[PDB]
Every structure is written in C-alpha cells, then in structure tokens.
Ligand binder design. Sequence first.
Ligand SMILES: [Ca+2]
Ligand SMILES: [Ca+2]
Ligand SMILES: [Ca+2]
Ligand SMILES: [Ca+2]
Ligand SMILES: [Ca+2]
Ligand SMILES: [Ca+2]
Lengths: 527, 527
Amino acid sequence: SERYLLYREWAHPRSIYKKQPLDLIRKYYGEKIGIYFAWLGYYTQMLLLAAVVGVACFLYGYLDQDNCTWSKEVCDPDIGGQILMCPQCFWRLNITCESSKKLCIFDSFGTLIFAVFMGVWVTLFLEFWKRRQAELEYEWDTVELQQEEQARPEYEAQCKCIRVTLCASAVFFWILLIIASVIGIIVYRLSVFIVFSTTPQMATSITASIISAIIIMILNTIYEKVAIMITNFELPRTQTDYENSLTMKMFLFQFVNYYSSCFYIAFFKGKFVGYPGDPVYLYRSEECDPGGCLLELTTQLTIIMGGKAIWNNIAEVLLPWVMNLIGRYKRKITPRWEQDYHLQPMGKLGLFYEYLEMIIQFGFVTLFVASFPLAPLLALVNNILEIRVDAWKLTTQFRRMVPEKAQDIGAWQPIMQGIAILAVVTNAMIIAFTSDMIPRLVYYWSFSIPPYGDHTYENPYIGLGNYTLCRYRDFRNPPGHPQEYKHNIYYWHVIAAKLAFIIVMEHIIYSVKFFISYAIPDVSKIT
Amino acid sequence: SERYLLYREWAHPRSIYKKQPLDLIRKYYGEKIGIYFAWLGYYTQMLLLAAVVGVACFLYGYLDQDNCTWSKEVCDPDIGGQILMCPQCFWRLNITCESSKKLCIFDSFGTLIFAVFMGVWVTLFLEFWKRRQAELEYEWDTVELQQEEQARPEYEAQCKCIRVTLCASAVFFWILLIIASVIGIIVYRLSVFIVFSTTPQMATSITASIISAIIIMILNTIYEKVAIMITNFELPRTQTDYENSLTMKMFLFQFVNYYSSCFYIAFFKGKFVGYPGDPVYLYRSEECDPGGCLLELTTQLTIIMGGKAIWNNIAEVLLPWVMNLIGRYKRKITPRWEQDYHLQPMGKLGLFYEYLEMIIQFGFVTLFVASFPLAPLLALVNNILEIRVDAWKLTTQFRRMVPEKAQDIGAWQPIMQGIAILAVVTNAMIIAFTSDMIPRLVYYWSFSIPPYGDHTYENPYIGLGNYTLCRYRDFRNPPGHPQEYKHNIYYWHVIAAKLAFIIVMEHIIYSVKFFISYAIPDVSKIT
Ligand SMILES: [Ca+2]
Ligand SMILES: [Ca+2]
Ligand SMILES: [Ca+2]
Ligand SMILES: [Ca+2]
Ligand SMILES: [Ca+2]
Ligand SMILES: [Ca+2]
C-alpha cells in the first residue's frame, strides 16, 4: 500500500509540516514529479532566507519611519497642510499623509540593501539548484538511454514555415490584445477616479488591481485553450518540440499578462506627464503621487500574489474535486480500476502548469523586489501550501501520472536564467525611476548646502478651483525662471544620478554574479 | 617526405597566399596544432569583413571631413585663431587644427555605426567558431577516451592553501608594479611635455606610446620567467591544472600590461582635471585636447599593434633561428636525429604564447574599436603574417611538436567570451566618455535653438602669460554665472546623455547578441 502511506505521511493538510519523501515519491510517481517537488522545496528553502532578510529590512524601515523627515513634513499641518498639488485630470498632501507614512518604508536604504541581497540570493539560487540537480542525477540514475523520440500521432496523421510564421503573428496579435486590455485598465482608472473623487486614489488603485487580477485569471484559460489549438494546428515532429513551443508561447503570454500592469506602474505610469501647460495627450495619461507610484506597485503586487495564492490554491483543490464530484453524480463496492478511472487524467503535459505558476511567482519575487521586501515572506507561505495542494491533486483528485525521466526541469531553467538577467536590471530601474530614493539622496547630499539650500550641514484649472500656484511632481522650472515650465538643472541632475546608479548597480551585481558562478563549482565535492 | 611538401606548399613566405592543408597538418603535427591554425584562419576571415566595414566607415568619415563644421571652425583663423586654451601644467587651437582635421574622422557617426557592427561581428564570431569546432570534432574524431591525467613530476617529487594565497598576493603585487610603471609613464609625459614645449603634445604622445610598448615588451619576458617559477613553486596535481593556472596568471598580467595605457587614455586621462582654480593634485594629473583624447588613444593603439606585428614577428622569425645559429656555431653529412636535435624544443606549453598573442590582438581589436575603424585592417595583415611565421617556427626552426588531442582551444575560449562581455560595455564607454561625439550631438540637437543658441534650425598663470580669459575644455560655469567655476546644467546634461547612451547601447547590443545566439544553433545542419 504505497499510496496509503504516501497519503498519510504526505499529500495531506495535516502533514504539511513534514519533509517530503523524495525517494518514495520517485519510486511511486516518477523522476519528473520527484525533481519538480525537490525544486519546489529548494525554492521554498531559499525564499525562507529571502523572507528573513526582507522582514529585517522592513523592520528597519518601520523603525526609521519615526525619523522620516519627508513623511513627517508631509504629515505636519504647518508644511504638509500647505501642499497644493496640481490636479490629475487640487488634492492636498494631507489626504496622502498616512500613505507617506507607509511609503517611506517602501523606499528606504534598507530596501536598497535588500535589493542587493536579492541579487546575491538569485545568484546563489541557480548554482546550488544545479549542484542538487547533478546530485540527483547521480543518485537516481537520471542519465539513461535517450532513444529517438516517437513522432506525435497528430504530426504523423497529416505528415510548414508559413504556418509557423502565421502562428507567431497570431501570438503577437494576442500579445497586442492583452496590451490593449491593460490600456483599458488605464482607461478604467481614468474613468473611475472621477466618480471615486466625488484618498480616492487608494481605493481606485486597489479596485484596479483586483480587476486586473481577475482579467488575467479569465484570460489565462482562454489563452491556454487557444494555444493548445494553435500548437495542434502547427506540426512538431516530436513531443519534445511540442513541449518546447508550448512552453515558449505560454511563458511569453503569462509573462505579458501578469507583468504588464506591474511594468506600467513601475516604468510607464506617471513617467511622461510633462507640465500642466501643454500636457501629454494620447488621452491624458495617468499621473502619480509625489513619492512615486512605488506604493501603488507594492499594493498591486501584494494583491496579485495573495489573490493568486489563495484563489488559485482553492481552485486547484476544488476543480479536480469538482470534476470528480460531477463524475460521481453521473453514476457500492468498487474495484481499483473503477475507483481510479473516475478521476481526471493528468494529460501529457502534467506539471507544466505548476512549473509555469512557480516561474511566474519567481518573476514576481525577483523582478519587482525593489518595491517591498515582504514579497518573499508571503511567497514562502504560498510555496508551503503549494507543495501540499499539488501533492493532493496528484494523489487523491487526479489519477496516477505515467512515470517520466527528467534529469532537469527543462526549458524552464534557461527561462529562469534569462529572468535573472532581466531582473537585476529591472530592480535597478525600479530603484532609479520607480523608487524616488534617488531624488531624496540627491537632495540630502547636494542641495542642503547654502549655495543650493540653507542648512549648515480649455483651461479647466480656473473652472475647477480658485488657486493661484499649484505644486507639480516634477523638477521643471518654477515661476521666475527665464524659461519657466521647462527642464532645469535639477531634472537632468536627477536623471544623470538615476542612470549612473543603474550602470553602477548593473555592473557591480553582474561582476558579483560572475564571481559567485566562477568560485562555486556546478558540481558538489561530495557528489 | 611529409615535411618537404609541408614546407614547399606551406610554412613558407612564398606560399603565404595559399590555403592551409588542415588535414595534412593534423596528420603531421597533431590535433591541437591543426585546431589552432584553423581558429587563426577563421579569425582572419572574420577580420577581413571587419576591416572592409571599418575602411568603409573611415572613408565615410574622410569624405565628411570637408563638412566637419567644428574642425573647419578650429582651422578657421577668424574663430580658431581666437581660441585661447588654458595651460596644462596658453597654446592656441591653431597648432592643433590639423589634429582636428584627423580627429573629426575619429569621432564620426560612421564610427558609431562601425562600433554597432563590431558588436554584431563579435556576436557572429563565437557562434560560427563553435559550429566549426563541432564540425572538426566530428571530422577528426577529437572526442576520444579522456583517461585520468598523470601527475606532474615536480608535483609527485614533493607530494598548500597558504601557498596559493601567497601566489595570488604576489600576482596582485606585480599587477600593482606594472600599474606603478604606467604611473611612471604618466610622470614621463608630465616631465617630457615641458622640454618638448620649449604641436609638442603629438610628438610627446608618440614617444610615450613607443616607450610604453617597449616597457611592455621588456616586462613580458620577465613576467614569463617569474610566473613559470611561481607556478612550479605551487603544486598542481595534474598538468591541466598547471596549464589553467598559468593561463589565468599570464592572461591577467598581459591584459593589464597591454591595456593599462589604453584604459588610462580612454577612461582616466583628462577625466578628473576640475577647473584651473583649485586643480586636482595627487601631482597635476594630465589634461587633454578639446576634441578628447580619442586621437591619442588611436595613435597609441596603432603604434602598439603595428610595432607588435612587425617587431614580434621578426623576433619569432629570428630568436629560434638565432638559437639554431648559436647551436651550430658550437659544433658535413648529418643524419635526421642530429639535424633535428640541434633545434630548440617546443616545450610542454607550445602554442600557449601564440594563443596569448592572438587573444591580446582580439582584445585590442574589440575592446577599443570605437577609437579608429582601421584596427581590423592591420590586424588582418598581422594574422596573415602570423600564420606563415608560426608555421615556419613549427617546421624549420623548432623541432617537431608531440601530437596532442584538443577538441577546443581550451581556457582561451571562455576568456574570449568574457572579453566580449567587457568589450561591448567598453566600446559604449569609449563612445560616451572617451569620444566627444555625445557632446556634439547634444549641441546639434538641443543648443542650436534660440533659447540656447541663435540658429533658426602659486598662481603661475600671470607669470607664464598676460592673458585675461582662457578657455578650458569643460562645461563648467563661465564668468558671469552666480556660482562661477562650477558645474552647470550643461555638464550634467552631457553626463546624463552619456549614461543614457551607454545604457541603451548595452541593452540593445546584449539583446541582439542573445537573439543571434538563440537563432543560430551551435551545431551546423550539415554537421
Ligand atoms: Ca498558486
Ligand atoms: Ca499550484
Ligand atoms: Ca557557477
Ligand atoms: Ca605577433
Ligand atoms: Ca606569433
Ligand atoms: Ca548561440
């Protein structure tokens, strides 16, 4: 009774805090299932330390929240009460004072330290993963005879370059489709901010994040179906080619869907707004708060990740169980074959979707870690739950999966490598453009001086208000400058500082990654 | 008589324009010699197209030299004759007019196009090289039984972590030694510019380049001897470990020696000079011409490469021949063994030094290609000569080398990969900081406008001259500014433009390299 023990001591909510019998699940399910579960466990282990360091940096930021001079000035009625921000489509900073209280934690030097540590942690991730992979290759004898692969039945049924190009054109067309949907989310925020105003922006951002997550979830299944149909339409000569093409297309689409809103908030929202005179029109691109949209990006990421965890895990629990229930309703002693056939077959893909979910989670954790250090914590929790729920679906709900030989996770590993190659740069960008820490450091080290400071060490504006001078979130020329409402020394200084920081961080982190890869061998000494 | 034919149709100055019998030299010398010669031939083939495109861009620059507005203004007595440059340690731009005539060609948009093409060419280099390597692996059956390697006799004579650390400390100490020698070259220019002044800077730069090349050549043999002694002092368990350690140490030292002056001119010389008030002291770091030190870097690179080619090839011809002559003088029908024993043995290293020379040439061609597009041309010539001279030294001068199995060039290939990873960035930097094209483009696209321009579309200064206002090569505040002799909008704008260009070029070129590597498979379809 291998399955009885495998369900009692594993694949059960009660046994969630027990080690995985990797050898036993290899003997039962197969090599691919075992290596997937081992990879998930190692990912959880690394995210544990990631979360510990993130919580440490978050506590550092929370402790320094009391000494946040800018946030306290925002919340100070003497100065913050006199802030007159220009309209987006004349809200004072007071309504955003509490936001600043939770925003100074988002952009603090502890967050930069954690971003550097996250680069280091991503570096340590892949090397130890491949060391463990070689260890498992030796232990389980994964390296065996790789005989010539049999052609797919649909490929041989009808026995092609133009078709591949048409498939690529359709994939890019659907990429433009989801991009247009995200633009609709931009239109939604513009349309719903006015009614919310009659701070409203916080609820608007939360609702927009919820709507975007729901749209992503809805479109995920639609693209799964259409991509399966398209990949069947094209002809891969082997099943491995089918798997690789489907992996590439699904990864591209899920990357775009999940990270389109995140990239818009990090690198597009509020970047190109100009000045109230001659504002940029498309129409009337979204603006952002003085402290940047790092708060909005953090809210969006937290909402997406938590909703994904909760709702997706509940769905993974129920949908196989719902299908089993509906099969049992179709219609008491029953044999093993009858008991197992009335369960959903896994399919030739299998763990592809769970791998895709974990890769999306890795992208959320690494690509956008400069926003809030608390992403790994919840991610760790997710992984914990994931191990059990997946195991449950592989033991009780679905049938038994045919064993497969898999010395590695497959095309997901190079994808992750590329992800890291992007993620470093992305984090740098988030610290530079998205996070307003660079302007604060620039002020603190170059403008408190007496030469720059004082310390020793249509026209709807008139219709919508009776204010004389409004403060905009830009470094452009204030009134009294010879060329007012235009770029100045401050704006180009800040942009140069951001670009120099990006270059320095990219080069230093890449050098550290190269040093770690060279010093740490890909094969363990014990192995 | 294999050697007779191999000397008649190959390894001879007359047969310099004939294809290499790769199969015949594999049958005679071995796998490693054949793969080295094939790699050199393919490198020459790629440098042929590199040189063609470089000459095309150089001709474009020479044709546009007539329309170089800045250079013609420099050579115009009405404006160029009124240029009053501040002293380095008050030379007018007229003495440098001809230099500007040959400098506008150095920094032209054709050079930027050629730098992009050089990134693309470096990308195409390695992929086709490894395709050819796999083809040769299949053809020559290079993949054979790699039995356990025998321990070195000196390693087993005396049967260690502290010793390795001491060796690394000594290597870094000698790196500091050559750095100090380059600093002495900096002191030499400061000391010899005054006597040359009594344009002098051109002759000073040429003499400094000659002296630096001679010093590099002198120190090369010294480091070869000391590195051999140190590597014998340390204990590698196998000959391959000895080869890898020697390769790393020799490559690091030769990289530092050859490229220290180049990096100083590109990224150190004239970068930190400040303003005549409170100048930077160490003492009195070197300054540069208004058009940047790209002319000096081009002169240094051309001198180093041409002198290396000519003198090093003559030495490779003569030194084995000189040793043969001195052996024959020691003391007529003689047998084969007597005829061949009176020749210098190749040694266990063999083609290591020729590989090192070619890697240094590749670094000169790629790392510094943003200076002058004519480097590949001469480099091609070098390679041509190299093939013959090396072959001669392997056939007539030295003895026959023991055949060795080498499916690849070895540790030089990853080194080259890293070189390319640096070279992209380096070229970007040379275009940004070293090349003054970015300030010219910034002016042409942002300062000709009426708001910025006028077009519609101790104190030794008084002792050394009676001038009132001198023009310095910096964007700092001119007199009349509220904070004069200080950074302004222009300087930070230019620095931001340089950093943004570097970031854009790095990302675009890296994306192109990734696309080329992914699209072009590492194995040929015919293979
Ligand atoms: Ca999930
Ligand atoms: Ca799951
Ligand atoms: Ca590594
Ligand atoms: Ca040479
Ligand atoms: Ca040579
Ligand atoms: Ca490739």
